[PDB]
Design a binder for this molecule. Structure first.
Ligand SMILES: COC(=O)[C@H]1CC[C@@H]2C=C[C@H]3CCN(C(=O)[C@@H]4CC[C@H]5C=C[C@]6(CCCN6C(=O)[C@H](Cc6ccccc6Cl)NC(C)=O)C(=O)N54)[C@@H]3C(=O)N12
Length: 109
């Protein structure tokens, strides 16, 4: 497992029932979010840990063909079959770092 980026973001998941974003893992705050490349089998995952307490708040596969939506310069989103994820980045630089790496993984897959 090699990290290909680190970016600061508040990791959100969408509550489909109540139609609002909610903090991933339960508590609002910023995480260090990586994309990890499993060099062995050429897979990628998003893993993020809260800065305060190290809680893993996201651990999710990036499948080939994923549609990554850059809604604003600091809020990006994507889906899986269960959840919609949103990253509210700490700065535009962090958003550019993470989107660059995500776009790279999706070209590589
Ligand atoms: C308290 O108020 C807040 O929540 C504030 C502060 C935090 C955050 C920051 C910023 C803006 C940016 C706008 N935005 C939203 O949520 C927007 C507005 C419209 C609303 C409608 C649907 C949403 C939610 C569920 C997924 N989806 C979609 O659009 C998805 C997007 C998508 C498109 C293609 C591939 C994958 C995906 Cl995933 N479409 C599809 C077909 O799946 C969505 O995100 N929405 C954020 C926002 O308001 N807020």
């Amino acid at each position: 497992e090699q990290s290909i980026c680190q970016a600061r973001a508040a990791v959100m998941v969408y509550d489909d029932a109540n139609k609002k974003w909610v903090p991933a893992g339960g508590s609002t705050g910023f995480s260090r979010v990586h994309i990890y490349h499993h060099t062995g089998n050429n897979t990628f995952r998003v893993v993020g840990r809260k800065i305060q307490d190290h809680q893993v708040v996201i651990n999710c596969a990036i499948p080939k063909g994923l549609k990554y939506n850059q809604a604003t310069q600091t809020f990006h989103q994507w889906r899986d079959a269960r959840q919609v994820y949103g990253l509210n980045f700490g700065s535009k630089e962090d958003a550019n770092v993470f989107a660059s790496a995500m776009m790279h993984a999706l070209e590589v897959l």
